[PDB]
Ligand binder design. Sequence first.
Ligand SMILES: NC(=O)c1ccc[n+]([C@@H]2O[C@H](COP(=O)([O-])OP(=O)(O)OC[C@H]3O[C@@H](n4cnc5c(N)ncnc54)[C@H](OP(=O)(O)O)[C@@H]3O)[C@@H](O)[C@H]2O)c1
Ligand code: NA
Ligand code: NA
Ligand code: NA
Ligand code: NA
Lengths: 499, 499, 499, 499
Amino acid sequence: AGLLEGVIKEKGGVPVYPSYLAGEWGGSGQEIEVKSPIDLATIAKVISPSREEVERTLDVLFKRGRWSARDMPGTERLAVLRKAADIIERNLDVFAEVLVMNAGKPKSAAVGEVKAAVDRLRLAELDLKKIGGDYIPGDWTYDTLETEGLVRREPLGVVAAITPFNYPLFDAVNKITYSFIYGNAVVVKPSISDPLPAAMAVKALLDAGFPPDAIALLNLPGKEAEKIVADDRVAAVSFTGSTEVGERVVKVGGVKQYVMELGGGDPAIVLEDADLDLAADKIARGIYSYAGQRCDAIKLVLAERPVYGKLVEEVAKRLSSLRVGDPRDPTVDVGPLISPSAVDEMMAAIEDAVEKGGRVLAGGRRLGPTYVQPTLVEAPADRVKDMVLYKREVFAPVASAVEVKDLDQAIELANGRPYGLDAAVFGRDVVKIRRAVRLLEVGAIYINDMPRHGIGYYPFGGRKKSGVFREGIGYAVEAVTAYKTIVFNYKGKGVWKYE
Amino acid sequence: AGLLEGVIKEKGGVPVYPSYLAGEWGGSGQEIEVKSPIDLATIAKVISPSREEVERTLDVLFKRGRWSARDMPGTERLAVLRKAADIIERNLDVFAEVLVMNAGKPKSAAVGEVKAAVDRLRLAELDLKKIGGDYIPGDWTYDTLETEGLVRREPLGVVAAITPFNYPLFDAVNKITYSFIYGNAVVVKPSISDPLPAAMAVKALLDAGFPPDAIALLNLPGKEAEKIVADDRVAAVSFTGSTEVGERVVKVGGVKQYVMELGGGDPAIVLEDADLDLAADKIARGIYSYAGQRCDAIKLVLAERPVYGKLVEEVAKRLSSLRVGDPRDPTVDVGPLISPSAVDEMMAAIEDAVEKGGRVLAGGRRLGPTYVQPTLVEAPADRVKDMVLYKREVFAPVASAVEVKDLDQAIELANGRPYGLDAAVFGRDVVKIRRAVRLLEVGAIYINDMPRHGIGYYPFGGRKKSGVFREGIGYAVEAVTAYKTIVFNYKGKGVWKYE
Amino acid sequence: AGLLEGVIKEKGGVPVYPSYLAGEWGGSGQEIEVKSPIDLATIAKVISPSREEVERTLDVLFKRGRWSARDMPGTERLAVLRKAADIIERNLDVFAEVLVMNAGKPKSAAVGEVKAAVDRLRLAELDLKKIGGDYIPGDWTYDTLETEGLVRREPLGVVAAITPFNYPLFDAVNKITYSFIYGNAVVVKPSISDPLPAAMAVKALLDAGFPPDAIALLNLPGKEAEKIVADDRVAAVSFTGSTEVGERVVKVGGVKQYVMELGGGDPAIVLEDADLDLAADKIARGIYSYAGQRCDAIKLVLAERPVYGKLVEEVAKRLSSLRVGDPRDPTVDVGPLISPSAVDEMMAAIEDAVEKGGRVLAGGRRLGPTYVQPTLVEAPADRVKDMVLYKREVFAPVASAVEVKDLDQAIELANGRPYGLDAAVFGRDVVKIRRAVRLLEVGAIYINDMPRHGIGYYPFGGRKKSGVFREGIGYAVEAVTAYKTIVFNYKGKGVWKYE
Amino acid sequence: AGLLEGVIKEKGGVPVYPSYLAGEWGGSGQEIEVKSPIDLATIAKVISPSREEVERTLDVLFKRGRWSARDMPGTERLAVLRKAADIIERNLDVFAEVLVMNAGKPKSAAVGEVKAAVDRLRLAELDLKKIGGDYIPGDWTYDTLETEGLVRREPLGVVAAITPFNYPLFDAVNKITYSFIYGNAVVVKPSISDPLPAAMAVKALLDAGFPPDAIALLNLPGKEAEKIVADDRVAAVSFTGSTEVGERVVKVGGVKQYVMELGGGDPAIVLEDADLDLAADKIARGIYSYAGQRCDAIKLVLAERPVYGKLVEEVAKRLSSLRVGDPRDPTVDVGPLISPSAVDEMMAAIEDAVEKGGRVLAGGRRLGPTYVQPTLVEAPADRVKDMVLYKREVFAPVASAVEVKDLDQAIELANGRPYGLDAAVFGRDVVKIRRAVRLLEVGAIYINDMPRHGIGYYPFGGRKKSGVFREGIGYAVEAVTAYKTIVFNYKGKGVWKYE
Ligand SMILES: NC(=O)c1ccc[n+]([C@@H]2O[C@H](COP(=O)([O-])OP(=O)(O)OC[C@H]3O[C@@H](n4cnc5c(N)ncnc54)[C@H](OP(=O)(O)O)[C@@H]3O)[C@@H](O)[C@H]2O)c1
Ligand code: NA
Ligand code: NA
Ligand code: NA
Ligand code: NA
């Protein structure tokens, strides 16, 4: 609605959302149904581009787009991003509604994501703490005397932004922002599961002045996107999703610049030192927020003997007092999961933990094809490692709780999972905290708080199976930019006497 | 000889070089013959590790090596690198000899590479202009108030260094240096074509104090290395080689941090402004140095109408006055190519240019299975683009020469190849130079000089098919290092009043 | 008018502007007449604070102000600066009028300064490319093992901003912006000659949300300001003015952080290579803009034999075709000088040049107590050095022109003055330009353009008698900020194994 | 002895040390007696230069020196500094002896300073993490489109290094190192009290290859140095000394770049959280090291109620168990103070504290004209602020001890002195530590350790009366370097399309 006034096709009673082919909205490939996880009902259809349209779109992005983006003064690109922020802001409710409608996101969360997208856009000003270059004098080596170097960052060209389902609006806006602020053209490929928010963001950007040939939004389902990734006109692939799909993306893409935010869960460690009120509060939230459909969601709780009982007790009470229902009730805390399949896996996973010695301390009851109570499962250290909930990321509101002897055991268990995205540590002793910070093999550690990538004010990314590289204001530049070195030779000319 | 005193096996009359399995020299896989391109005679054999030894080596590097490298104080790692420099230096002649023996490198060039390796090691001090981290205050956003960020760079763990044949000693030393200075363990995989220099460097490093379990040298032929690349204990792959093999490496490795120096040739542009003496001199060298077996070798010469004649004339004279023979004669300018196959391709390539309108202006005569004269082939702009010498990188001493109307045509042709490593521009006008610098799509541009990565005093790397990321003192850190973000939450505590 | 609605006192027919005493507008010291250089008529009066009010103001700034500025989140300080930009923008005409009224600035120039002030405020976002800190690992020295360093920049406290007459609005806004963006409180001391624009800027800032106790505007005449400079509650003095007054400021202030932009003229060099059209245009402007009352004004023109004639010819024609009159005529090019005294000095200076062999090539005629034609005086290299116009900065629209043999003589003469603010070089040859850049002893060199500090997009400042330190977006932080180092000792604790 | 073989004049039985006049050792001004604080006996004489020799020396440094230093390739300057390190190292004992002889420094301390000087020299490699420059694109503002900026750091020219008495060798070496590594010429002015170590360092540097006209060592007593400071050929003054002399230096020098390390004492805070063993140990040392003749010496101890008793108890025991005597006994802990006057002030200061309610807890007994026991004086919070030991820096081994209610009172008292050099905080709670770090107004805070500038691995400097700017590896560059901005204008040329 609204922004997509003349774009959306009212056909067969259901709104039809077209792909944006770097110049004109359209598409003539298969139409795909977009369902809401709230009622499993079709809320719209998206037109996927045909193979020829994908080909033509990439051709336009490559031959015209990257130059349109690059030739637009940085000061103007920023203006575009700021105007788009204004547009999204005044259309907040419609944007939030779609997030609730399409992603099953609780009203307040949906509003939070729209605001995050808006802030991210406005902070593009801070993404400049990085586009400056370096000057290198040549007199620190005899071979380089009477020589000089200039190292500048330049945009790579066409960046493919591949987005997961859990933060459809923000991720698209985020990847588009850091790719565009530096002069790249962008091909957005949203999850076919919830591509509507991206269509709205893209539209807002186009209305804001975004070079019409420098951006594309292709509604291609999963494997159909490989055509974009494998193409040589795509210099970089910014991907946020599962470890398995990310692996496939790299293998399909080959040599190319990548940003792989592959998530997985995050462990939380509570030292005997911690404020248990703060810890229980933040840990409970980290477990249930958006029905645990957050890569930075808490999946494992580790607490030392002296505080384990009280901590898990408080977290259990907070979880069980949560209202699960229609994300439309500003009263509901937890909406549905993206699909019934996601819930199936969570139940099977809980069964696995229980079979292996685990005990549910809160939740555990499925409430419908796509509804479940955020669950907390207790587990003995000697058996937790073999449980699916530990070895894998069950994208749902569920976490293991484990009592530990000391910090070293906490760290050991925390590092025992195959992932390494973030980790949380609640405590007050600087030495123990410093040790945890040193030994936790993750991209980010949150001291006295739940893991929260937020809008990327602080850089984040993975270690181990959680991926490579970082996103964040100012740090994402590394993935969508390339250095250009210019060496000047003045040997023999009379510039320098001896140096 | 020398350093490898008790390591090399004198068996069957031929010296047998063993792999270094992160702790002990050995191996029990197939023995492979190492031949000299000077006479095509076997000069040694290398023992490739068996599958179980590769497995065990990776296990050691992962479980012990990365910690030994990381736990060694940076100041000590530097001491090791400096001691190794001392050792290689006093063993210069033996190192140079092997480069001449095994790589067919002219005496002076071999000496140059040993010195480059020595300097690179000693400059590890300058690789520190990057291991420092960032402090991020949280008051530039309301959501981050009473919060702070600390971003540190940490080593990734186990880096796989894969080296090409053309600079066996330097590349190994270089990749080991920047991987180790930051705390990584390293698995070196040299070209089976000339693995001897690496064995000597590794030995020198081990004698210098390099953690014995933090380094490995595996003599595995081509595809046998995929076992190292595909392994999850290898967090990064530093690869220098052909575009095609690099592509295979990424597809085999999957998600991982990469540095892909994929070479290709470099075009040289001469403006009517240029000092033609300097230009002819540098361009001639760029074409023939090490029989053109340099990724930064000149493969295409573009000169404006008014200077084309004189320029190509002078370059032709310099090339034809070159002495081709045994790299052992301090009198020889050009030794043999690495293999007769390499020469076959160069002759076929020349034939192609001639068939398509090209004309040899110098050289063109094969002198033996692995010897050829550095060749310069003239070609009309209207036909050069379809010639193999243009569309491809013929790793040999051969370059196309093309007359152009103006800078724009020079740039067009320069950018018309599928590669984008470096480019050279000879001229004096700041505006034309600035324009060339803006439009040349390459990782590095050399003003008034031949392209020379040298020891990486200035960062270099590719665009387009020449790869991704950069090597260079201080810049290589990006590929073998990862950020670790630590966010401290002080909300509610009495640290800050309002900010 | 406007913003100062309830502030300005309508007394005795003339508007009376009060000082802002960090909380309330007022003052009870001597009232001082403010005259326009357009007609020498009193246009207003300013109330200077009494000694007790200065004392009380400093006390407030120190005891409350620096905390109010520091405790306001950076994100809020930026909001204040942006709101103030909005206010000044919608009040553009009134701001421009006062600049014309009070400074005798040509209409378009006045509009340019208001816009510059507005842009400077809005770019405060880019002043953040510097408030981030550094993290220093301790393992690069054995003595520092198991130790770490955190280096943050903090505001100094109370910064005294002392402004000259030539850019009353911008300078005040500029110094306030970079002092405040980082958390400092500010005491503005404008030239008693034209303090009105500052009063308006300060008012706009206060209306924008600027902490009322964190800013002060004291209308103190010259030496009366020493009371502010000498006070220990003033941690930094940002001063832009004459070399002689700056010297006095430091001697009165003692140990303290300083930014001394002491101006002086700038020499312009034209190589036989230069586009003479561009050169004549830019040089003419550099000589006359704002009746040469610009620290970055061109005061000496040096051109090589082959272009000297044409260059000076064209510059002379441009100068003589200038309309001198009331800055109110959008038709006038040059308004009056700030005072008749300034004109007296310019005439005496011209007389000196003529007596010493100089010859007027354009202008030279005084048109009134405060009006004169922008003048160009030719002079032989062998005598120019002893002329007052060379040895000194005659703040007026006048410049010496001198023919030179080659670049070396140009540089010699350019460096022969006691100043070293900027220098301009018109030419195209990279080698000659690089040499000029190396040998010109100045803070900034402009290639193919007149010197233009502008809003400080690029940092600028002096060498030799032109002062110390730099202003500019991102660079001014050094003068109003201080480092705070935090060293953490973990020796003996179990954080690190060996490193 | 040794290095000064042919330099020192054996006249009248006492060794006569000449000034180094930037080219030749000599001098013809008054000869001055240099006494040892060990026995008050003359151990040598130094020749101060005459006014004409000072004039000539400055002329040489300015006209030749700054170019010799600047024209020497950075790589060579580093070689010089490293060679000098080698020379000082092999002459360690002689250097240490002079420190013991001339400064009354305990044997181990003297050895520590020689080693510090040696390390500082060798770490000059790390002073390079700063001489690189910045490249600034012009498309972030419309006015700067088609424009670019290059900002390089250049040496200022002649730096005057003024050294205090307490670390004669290190300070001279340190200031010379960071001034020279960047290309400056240096005039060293050591304390006439102990100028011998500087003469030896300078000699070692000259033997190492230091440009003979780029360095000078003038033995001028106190006020006689103003001639160097006030001279316009001296672009920067690096001064370490008393607040009062520093003030005089700035007032004599006028506009110039300064580094003012003005010391004062440091307060130490111990939270109920602290390891009291570590705290007592470090605090005791901080109080007595080099008889408290350290700017980073502990002068005030603040401990919370619950640990005050035990802490002060342990510190008292450590102090009273100290052996005071001839610094030559590797058995002595504390040698003499620099002069009997220094001891007089310490006794008077103790008397003052006692008269105002203070009580000596350890030491307090004078042992000779220049010997005293390191003293610890207890004082009630309600009276400590008026005691001389609090309000002033009594350069001697003496500190006040004060019990406090909580962190806020500790901070209040810590900030109540007029100085702000460093501060120490022993404790473990991250929140309390973070708060202390925020509120302590000092240049450096040491967590769980005594303040130790060391060789400047971490930057340090003052706040309030302790001075301005910082010294430290990599940070000292700001004081002896200046930016040079080069702006290139390409407006109208065909470099850029629109951006
Ligand atoms: N971009 C740069 O900075 C740069 C610098 C120097 C050279 N180069 C390029 O490198 C080439 C010269 O070296 P080269 O001819 O020896 O090229 P190459 O064949 O591409 O070198 C490949 C390296 O990878 C190993 N390898 C081969 N197949 C592999 C596989 N399937 N999996 C894992 N590793 C494998 C090779 O070992 P084996 O030798 O045992 O097969 C060799 O050590 C040229 O194309 C040149 O342009 C680029
Ligand atoms: Na590919
Ligand atoms: Na993989
Ligand atoms: Na003062
Ligand atoms: Na002065």
